[PDB]
Design a protein around this ligand. Structure first.
Ligand SMILES: NC(=O)c1ccc[n+]([C@@H]2O[C@H](COP(=O)([O-])OP(=O)(O)OC[C@H]3O[C@@H](n4cnc5c(N)ncnc54)[C@H](O)[C@@H]3O)[C@@H](O)[C@H]2O)c1
Ligand code: NA
Ligand code: NA
Ligand code: NA
Ligand code: NA
Ligand code: NA
Ligand code: NA
Ligand code: NA
Ligand code: NA
Lengths: 491, 491, 491, 491
């Protein structure tokens, strides 16, 4: 019953060239669906439709209160279809059903948060420094927005972009990862049910290498919003520059998990596993870089390694499963290549580091949860985002050394500090160059607070009021209420 | 008594290669000063010093209240030295001394505004959706910032960047236009008198082609703030992408001056001259594109042309001067080439369009104030920013047509609507895709309100609270106040 | 099927003394229902329950997001029960069913607005002027709130108080007008369906003279929020002073309707009728004081008078009815007494000023729509709030005189300016000492914007962000992160 | 050289009846100065002048930027005259010169803060839920404000009221405590030097019993701002009610100083002395109610008592003095009466509790620093604000009991928690019903953050943005841009 087509200008349409793509379940590498594989001309048509819709004013000039009501209706549909959406996300991405349910709860809350925010702030009145003038700043929708999402949390990442775009009155063109389009197709069906003016929302399906440059480089786009890897992000930004187009980027990280000797030890072990291995480490927020105080380093490594051996791999639909497969053959190959890099530069693969042998896992894209030890900040395995079920462990002596090491990367997305000394944790948090810092927690983020990176982890923010602001533009309207001639130029 | 050197890491220093540049007065093309012409290694040293200073915390961890007091001290020095600063700006850039005084008054007010804003907003407390958590957003200085300014309003543009950078606790590296460094050198001397930690402020002098790429592309930069032309801006953005560096750009415009038939006619003529010819049209806010309602078009053209013939050209130091020279041989040549373009595509040079013949103007870079008529939106002369003492005049029939034509450019910086029907002016203002819209005024902007462009006129804002926000970064600190093990992974 | 009891500490309960009150329909003066008439001990028990619930934290420490979801659920129930609620409001208060439907649409929007606002703040991070300190302002629910509403728009006024109280996490005790409790009982039934912790919400039914002083004067109350008349409001404020309790008051007005000679004349006549006679003038926002420019005063009076003669009086349930009865015998008597005052001080009753004679209106509390002319600012009829279907008409010569007269009252709630000259309307609006000014409109207010009075019209605001803020209290938490002894006192 | 007169409507004037008052130095009870003792007619004249000035618009319509510049000029004058002002405050109030210097530094910062805030927020643009409307909220000065200050920190408390009143464009009438007018007279002289429109600022000198009711009860007042005791505050609020006038009250407190067994012990002793005895305990922020964990109660009492015996009493001008005299005979008598109350209800005067005998202290209004032990929450000595150099000590067993006891008073101004367990201190801080909570500090407050009380400690806030907001009023201006007749009433 799921659509196999793109959604352009109010219609479900095939690709202009009738091409298709088979979508795969990473658990067994079986084809689960076939969808349209769109062309660059389809993408251009969608952008032009979005522009036409924006200029018509049917959505952009709708009242903010009414826009909020429609975004709330989307939220309710997510909750109504929570089970089926979660199952589809697990089928498409491989992560556990429980993880998918949590995603759907978050997605409902994202739409609901932005629904509520829609009508809360139209700008400001400025006390003008010029007598006999009125000065106001009006906040308008930024315009036409292109939105590109990755394969790890397809619908969650889509919601972070769609909700504020709709709440503010923008028109959008979204393109999900070509290998994971299923939930994004479904959410477009649900949005269509709610009802938006023709051209306000558009869904393109296809390879980034075919349609991506149109989405980032088109002159009618006012904002490109992208979540993915650093290489694609940089390429998008350079293409966006051709029209001086606003960019919002979230590009992953090398997130430190800092564990002091006065941490609650079993909590720290639990959260080190959570940070490292949820969704097989395929998370922008993954705690791939463990920094542990020297005094407890050996204790910690032994404890972590013993637990990693017990992680239950399997089908995301099976209730006992703790960790599913990685997303694709290409991604598994990349993780495997990093194991070779790590060994060649002198690190130790303490546990894991290979494909599992078990019969029920042999047809899937599984990779064992892995701990890499005896490494240092100079190493590629420590500096680079592997985005797999892999953590490195480094020791540190002092609070100052923990901070130095944690900040010694090109990234700046998120991190954690574990210590029962809250004063110390707060000092460390203040010094980490990260968009989010958790004190005695991990992977906590939500619609109410902005998420994004310092340094190469991104530009701008998603979620919160700051997330909504990516979709607004300020206009200063200054009215002279007693205009007088300047009489500078001779008469 | 003015310094001839760069200011790097608390010391006035020559270029690493001892190279120098002769600075010219455009009124007579005479050499007025000789300054150091820095190298890319000087720029890198400055950026590294800025980073070191930032990490030291001496400025970034100073209280916001005290940072505000120092910014206020800069403001007071500008006012103290108003006369000498104005004279330097007029010598270096050619605009009238009266215009330069107005600039110094504005600059005082910019510093004073940001001094007052420094300690007014450290972030937010978030009502977390997770029980037993505290969520806060702390706003920190963005980090190390590079600041590149143009030749038209050197100190004014510098102040828009320096003031918020210092107020927020950033370290900065500034590079003024190579052809107009004098007031920027002077302001650095004044800042040095106020006293800032070593490395907090740095001044590089040199050609954009030699040191610009280091300033935009260095890994230790967190924000590149640029004001200038679109070609350089796009280039900067592409280079900034290499490290996913934030950019704030202001790139000029094709600003419409919309004159309805129910405008106060003599006011509209006065403001059309002001929009077209202040600083010989070398203004990001210049009203180069006049759109006049058809019913008064002939009346308007005759009136404007008659006034343009009376504009007094001369030395900026002479009180009777209404318009000085353009900035350089290269810029005058560009303006001259546009006259040829306009004629070839079928427009009429109604008045001006050449160098003036008068003896006292023959040694200077003068160009006559010009009105181009019988043109249309398809023409290069109408679409492209000439940045000279040149306006085009197009007619429109309806309010809808005025909006369409005004929005028919790649730019989106500022514009005006002249009409005694305020309701109509407000309708038009709401539909113009411009960062600033004046109703019955022109060239009005000030520290209290954000300034910047839609579309190819820029990214981000300068001035106002939004201007300060370019120099901040948000950090979400989430504390779990009752941490519990998740117990997801097997034990 | 409607409850007849109070709702105290999670239970529907009779009065402690078993007393009751008969509720009347003003259209026919028939008894329509009988409810409990509570005692001062019931009110005290409710306040103590509200305090106990607040201290338990079950609502006050619930997440803001979840509080918002519950307030949204109340909003949806209002819409679900729109027809029955509207009919009950018309039965109890006499206004037209069409007016009641509009109320129910507004009430839905009030709850929805506050539902969406619930989780959008939390407080601020302050950049502290003291080194080695953290400064934050946390916004908490104000505490226990008592809420007292009037008989004119019972559920609408209740919604303005309940929505923000619940959104912020307060516990509340509400007492509707003793003569119009029906829709307030119903909304409590609906809130019970949504589910709130025992003691969070409480409904007291009874005479202000019996239970009012407890509600305003109890030591466990943190805010008293009252909407009604000036005499009761002043009494409440004086009683609240005994515990230095916050007060939010809205006390009606003497609202000017300013009509210039360049107003759209038929619009001004239409809106003068709307301002004067909706709900038989029993509206805090009624335009009871018409100020009309002398040049059109005769034209205006004749046009208004001719229309007033055509106003259709009748049963609020009948679709042709334009104006229902007034609320009670006591109120009709008050209005009648004002007619005598007006004549005695020299004014003219130009039309109306008595009970209508028609057979179908004889059993109801009807009073004819009335226009009073030949009056001036010195008169009681002009200065005092009659709160009936009565308007006075005064002339003014100039814009300056209009402002002077409009501001010449003890009140300051709302007003309008009618003029096609928007600049003039804006000048006047800026000078009027009124919480709301309409330019070319009347009776426009909504959840998104604050409503309240200057001068004797009130203290504080309802609706908007400022309305929510009445229900919050600020706490500055300052942590010294490197505490040192002061060593002032000798050792 | 100091003025002896009132300042009314731009002129220094004596009392209407030529009455005067002798001002005393509490160190030696000698007459130090004689000032005018104004009449209620003088107060009325000042209020009418303030109203006339407000309506003139000369200050209320001045640009916010310029108002800020003038407030900054006042700040600079305070710093310029720091020495003389500090000496005058010490002469008039008795506190140490070092304390007075700190006050003057704080006062400079208060004026500077508000100077910087003046032009930062003129209101909001609202996204209206009604099509074809514009909705804006303009923030105006509240109007005419009366300001009444106490004798303990005369100029500091005056600055908290004057600075925001002037920044926002209000007109003000200030009346300092009749017994301590000196620095308030001086600051009026300084303000006059800056220059404000006639009637914008006014100073009344006299007994609260003679002129106070006019200041709180006059119909032309829009806000009464009072800092003092609860009895006077309640009386002011009841009088203000006569015109439904806004009130801002700060009425002192029973501030808890909570010391856990895991506090830094010597820090806690130091801060218990600071909280109890600065300005001889005559501070709204005094830590008069010490709550100490039972486990360390005996240790703490002995350590505190031993230190209290060493406190150096003397002349505020002498550098070795740690504590000066109390303010007046009447106040010393009140403190003495409380010693009798404490003993009669069963408490122990552990140290102090009498006038000192030493020869150099015999002519002054000295009272020994006192510690009261063996008391409980039921006692008047624990519940009531003594406002002298007196602390009570109660024990608590648990964190829960500490919170219960601390919240068991009618007040709610400020308090502290001392514990090295920052998580615990934060839990306690969140549960205390206090406007300010210090974690490991005491007496820390500043212009950047709001100060005020829950419960009987006050209404509203001073300092910070919220403090400025007491001096603003919101006006919703709603413009219908396409007005249509409603056609409800028959034609
Ligand atoms: N931040 C995150 O959540 C996240 C998610 C996925 C991957 N990554 C990182 O990126 C690495 C590479 O992953 P990847 O290559 O599979 O993902 P990617 O960075 O290319 O992101 C994929 C998305 O970008 C699109 N895309 C590709 N080329 C584009 C182009 N030229 N223009 C516009 N869009 C284009 C894809 O079609 C897809 O929608 C991963 O190993 C990981 O380190 C991060
Ligand atoms: Na898939
Ligand atoms: Na970045
Ligand atoms: Na030059
Ligand atoms: Na742009
Ligand atoms: Na009734
Ligand atoms: Na009032
Ligand atoms: Na004194
Ligand atoms: Na109170």
């Amino acid at each position: 019953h799921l659509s196999q087509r793109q959604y352009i200008d109010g219609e479900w349409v095939e690709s202009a060239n009738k091409n298709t793509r088979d979508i795969i379940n990473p658990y067994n590498q079986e084809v689960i669906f076939t969808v349209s594989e769109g062309t660059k001309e389809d993408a251009e048509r969608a952008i032009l439709a979005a522009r036409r819709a924006f200029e018509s004013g049917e959505w952009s000039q709708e009242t903010a209160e009414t826009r909020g009501k429609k975004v709330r209706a989307i939220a309710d549909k997510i909750k109504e279809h929570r089970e089926a959406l979660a199952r589809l996300e697990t089928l498409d991405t491989g992560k556990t059903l429980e993880e998918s349910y949590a995603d759907m709860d978050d997605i409902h809350n994202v739409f609901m948060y932005f629904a509520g925010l829609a009508d809360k702030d139209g700008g400001e009145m400025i006390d003008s420094p010029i007598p006999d003038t009125e000065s106001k700043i009006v906040k308008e929708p930024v315009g036409v927005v292109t939105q590109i999402t990755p394969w790890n949390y397809p619908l969650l990442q889509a919601s972070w972009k769609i909700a504020p775009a709709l709440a503010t009155g923008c028109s959008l063109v979204m393109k999900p990862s070509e290998i994971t389009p299923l939930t994004t197709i479904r959410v477009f069906e649900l949005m269509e049910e709610v009802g938006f003016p023709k051209g306000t929302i558009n869904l393109i399906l296809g390879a980034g290498s075919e349609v991506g440059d149109v989405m980032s480089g088109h002159k009618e786009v006012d904002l490109v919003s992208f979540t993915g890897g650093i290489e694609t992000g940089k390429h998008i930004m350079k293409n966006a520059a051709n029209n001086v187009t606003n960019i919002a980027l979230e590009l992953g990280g090398k997130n430190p998990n800092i564990i002091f000797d006065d941490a609650d030890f079993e909590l720290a072990v639990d959260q080190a596993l959570n940070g490292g291995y949820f969704h097989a480490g395929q998370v922008c927020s993954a705690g791939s870089r463990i920094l542990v105080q020297n005094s407890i380093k050996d204790k910690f490594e032994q404890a972590l390694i013993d637990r990693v051996k017990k992680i239950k791999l399997g089908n995301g639909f099976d209730a006992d499963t703790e960790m599913g497969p990685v997303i694709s053959t290409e991604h598994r190959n990349k993780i495997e290549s990093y194991m070779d890099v790590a060994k060649a530069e002198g690190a130790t693969i303490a546990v894991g580091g290979k494909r599992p042998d078990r019969d029920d896992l042999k047809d899937g894209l599984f990779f064992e949860p892995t701990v890499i030890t005896n490494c240092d900040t100079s190493m590629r395995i420590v500096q680079e985002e592997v985005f797999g079920p892999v953590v490195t462990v480094e020791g540190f002596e002092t609070e100052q050394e923990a901070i130095q090491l944690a900040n010694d990367s090109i990234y700046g997305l998120a991190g954690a500090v574990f210590s029962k000394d809250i004063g110390k944790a707060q000092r460390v948090a203040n010094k980490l160059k990260l968009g989010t810092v958790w004190i005695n927690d991990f992977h906590m983020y939500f619609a109410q607070a902005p998420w994004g990176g310092y340094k190469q982890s991104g530009i701008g923010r998603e979620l919160g009021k700051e997330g909504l602001e990516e979709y607004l533009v300020s206009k200063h309207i200054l009215t002279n209420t007693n205009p007088q001639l300047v009489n500078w130029f001779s008469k």
